[PDB]
Design a protein around this ligand. Structure first.
Ligand code: HEM
Ligand code: HEM
Ligand SMILES: Cc1cc(N)nc(COC[C@H]2C[C@H](OCc3cc(C)cc(N)n3)CN2)c1
Ligand SMILES: Cc1cc(N)nc(COC[C@H]2C[C@H](OCc3cc(C)cc(N)n3)CN2)c1
Ligand SMILES: C[C@H](O)[C@H](O)[C@H]1CNc2nc(N)[nH]c(=O)c2N1
Ligand SMILES: C[C@H](O)[C@H](O)[C@H]1CNc2nc(N)[nH]c(=O)c2N1
Ligand SMILES: [Zn+2]
Lengths: 405, 403
């Protein structure tokens, strides 16, 4: 048949061919000799212009004015700007399209059915660390919306020739402190040990809890990062209880409402937005499975299993599986009681299948990273497990970038 | 470039250098990864695969460069030059089969790769004889519940003629009967092979767990039908340690997972019929075979029996029922003294395998999507372990169905 990858769903027996992958401009890490799909992060005058031309072409196609006079004029105007300055600038509506397209292009995101519904805050006028804070607080207030969460991104000024970057040092806008103890263990979230210690080196007075919300370390160009404490009333958290296990509330577990990634680079048309935090709402497994049960995170499985009186001395009791399921259930139940938006892993994966069909019809495929899209409990119980996926890099894109220190 | 391979739970890092030994391309390119696809789409080359394989063998027995090694290379050269093909000595076959298992990227059970009973059935000239060898394989491997890994190797592919083939995908398979009203009674995965048995003379049953006969095919002949003696096929009724109603569901599964439709390639030679078996990991039965929607699909029935709220996904009724079903399988196999490994023990053993292999060969090819179990992924260590996938030979391969 077609010379595009054939893609099969083994639950349903249905077949598609991905033609979209033909548009990839950027090589991933695989070769015919070996596949590196399971690695988390495997290792410009005329180069900018070709990325910019491509992006402008994407824009004009999206508004159905390809080949138009307005399209040709924008193209000239971009090359003139690069010509005289080395860079160029997006129109507002271009930025909005490019931000959404970056989300839509993100292979690791199961929540892409929502991609067209993204509030884009333009913060390209921002000129200080103090102003970044205001923009960030506004983002948090808008996005949180007292529990009825709204997807959003806030875009700060782009990288510029020989000027320092805007950066948010924290990986997320909300992070619990991780305090290294004398014995070598950690109180709080071990994922955050390094940022915690950077906050302390930069003048923060540390708490001693398991859920101390961290301050933000915000860096305006060519300045030391400045420290900003989020007013507590802005940071919506959800205490965790279980619907029938009454003792679960006594564990004092909690999580925050708003998942807002702040350390990734938004690339659009070769332009690099080094600070562009974005937020959605949580899939319940992120909290109840990874953040709470990973051995290298809060690691609470054994404690919960012991409370549930399970036999923790043997694997074949499936004590881990039982406790994990109850932890996820408590996450879902508590978020529901508190009226804070959340999506379980069944509803989310079902919606992603719908997204796949939509994208097949709209673009001829959808880049997806199977290992990231399949949830970390109950995998084959979700429809995405049975769905082959093709993974490739399209731009606009969100990318990892090196830590600023 | 040698990939840096990180474990994200422990922060430990290795470099896979074994991948340089791959002489066989997989489906990925720098423009797109196809690692999630289940099956993506001359004398001088036989000689090079043959020399390489003989070189692997003499090196395995340390005698790399000896008289015996050099003479054996010439035998292989002489035979290919004269006939376009060659034959393996039994010791070479035994080594090659083990190595194919070892190299199988999708197998989580490879800590066991060195314990493999290898039956040479290359002196087989008929479907009848294949059946005798298969019965002996089942008897050995089953061993009254104390299961033992095994492979039986029937005669290789030859340019002149049809292949020896076992038509069935496994040696034990439950019938799947389609109903004019669309539904399937039994195992929907075996509708086709069920229908093929009927068409070749089998009197069907009408249960949910009717064990199929084998269709065995000798070269250029119609396949023949052979009913396995019920006494040879060990099965485990499923009950649950606390939920009494669960036994009333009538569920069971067989003890012996024996794959019979894959080709075994050693030194360029191809073995189209080479059934191989180990023991089950509980999630293969409890999660996939019983809970897949296109398999026995029993999740709902179990949830109702547990009185769960089936109206909404957010009660996690599915997750809760799947767990009890896996528990029942583990409990039932244990009660019956039939070998089984749960998915926590299995993946822990695989992590140990990765480490042994790192020391021994500088790597291990592994397919993360297959290694990570279908429930409780991130609760197992392998979820957090990066993996490099690539094709080494000797290898097991998929091959076209013979009809
Ligand atoms: C609206 C609800 C949303 C849900 C339920 C959702 C769900 C998810 C989940 C479960 C992941 C994997 C996270 C992990 O394991 O750490 C993820 C990754 C991601 N999503 Fe979303 N998403 C949502 C909205 C968004 C939005 C608004 C953006 C960007 C504008 C976005 C971009 C991403 C990116 C870039 C990743 C990859 C992160 C990385 O590589 O570390 N998603 N999404
Ligand atoms: C001794 C205990 C064994 C265990 C627990 C085990 C476990 C597994 C599991 C869980 C899978 C994934 C199966 C699936 O999802 O359908 C698998 C695949 C496989 N194993 Fe094993 N294995 C064992 C022995 C063997 C032996 C003896 C061989 C060969 C001699 C072997 C070769 C394979 C191959 C080739 C596959 C891939 C099959 C395919 O592509 O569909 N394994 N193993
Ligand atoms: C927007 C959004 C919604 C939602 N429900 N969940 C998220 C979670 O994304 C969090 C992001 C930050 C960590 O990144 C780890 C990481 C490390 C490295 C080296 C690369 C990479 N891409 N990702 C895990 N995923 C984000
Ligand atoms: C030896 C062994 C031990 C154990 N515990 N489990 C097994 C399970 O193997 C069953 C085998 C047959 C199915 O084949 C599906 C399949 C289809 C296709 C087109 C290709 C392919 N490689 N695999 C999946 N795995 C085998
Ligand atoms: C090694 C492996 O790639 C790594 O643990 C991945 C697997 N899948 C994942 N999937 C999601 N959604 N998030 C993750 O952090 C990971 N971790
Ligand atoms: C599409 C996807 O690759 C397919 O569902 C795979 C996923 N992982 C698997 N893993 C195992 N062990 N066995 C399988 O059959 C599958 N199926
Ligand atoms: Zn790949």
């Amino acid at each position: 048949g077609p010379k595009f990858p054939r893609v099969k769903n083994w639950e349903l027996g249905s077949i598609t061919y991905d033609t979209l992958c033909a548009q990839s401009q950027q090589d991933g890490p695989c070769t015919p000799r070996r596949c590196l799909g399971s690695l988390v992060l495997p290792r410009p005058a005329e180069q900018l212009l070709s990325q910019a031309r491509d992006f402008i072409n994407q824009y004009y196609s999206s508004i159905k004015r390809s080949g138009s006079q307005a399209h040709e004029e924008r193209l000239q105007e971009v090359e003139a700007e690069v010509a005289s300055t080395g860079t160029y600038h997006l129109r507002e509506s271009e930025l909005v399209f490019g931000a959404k397209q970056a989300w839509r292009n993100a292979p690791r995101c199961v929540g892409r059915i929502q991609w067209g519904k993204l509030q884009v805050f333009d913060a390209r006028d921002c000129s200080s660390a103090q102003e970044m804070f205001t923009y960030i607080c506004n983002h948090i207030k808008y996005a949180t919306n007292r529990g009825n969460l709204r997807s959003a991104i806030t875009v700060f000024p782009q990288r510029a020739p020989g000027r320092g970057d805007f950066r948010i040092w924290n990986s997320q806008l909300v992070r619990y402190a991780g305090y290294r103890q004398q014995d070598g263990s950690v109180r709080g979230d071990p994922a955050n040990v390094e940022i915690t210690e950077l906050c302390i080196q930069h003048g923060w007075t540390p708490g001693n809890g398991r859920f101390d919300v961290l301050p933000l370390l915000l860096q305006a160009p060519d300045e030391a990062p400045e420290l900003f404490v989020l007013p507590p009333e802005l940071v919506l958290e959800v205490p965790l209880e279980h619907p029938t296990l009454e003792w679960f509330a006594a564990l004092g577990l909690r999580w925050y409402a708003l998942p807002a990634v702040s350390n990734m680079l938004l690339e659009i048309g070769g332009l690099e937005f080094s600070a562009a935090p974005f937020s959605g709402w949580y899939m319940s497994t992120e909290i109840g499975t990874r953040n709470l049960c990973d051995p290298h995170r809060y690691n609470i499985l054994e404690d919960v299993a012991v409370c549930m009186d399970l036999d923790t001395r043997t694997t074949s009791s499936l004590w881990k599986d039982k406790a994990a399921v109850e932890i996820n259930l408590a996450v879902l139940h508590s978020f529901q009681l508190a009226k804070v938006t959340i999506v379980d892993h069944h509803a989310a994966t079902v919606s992603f299948m719908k997204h796949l069909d939509n994208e097949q019809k709209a673009r001829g495929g959808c880049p997806a990273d199977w290992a990231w899209i399949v949830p970390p409990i109950s995998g084959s119980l979700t429809p995405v497990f049975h769905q082959e996926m093709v993974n490739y890099i399209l731009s606009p894109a969100f990318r990892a970038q090196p830590d600023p220190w």
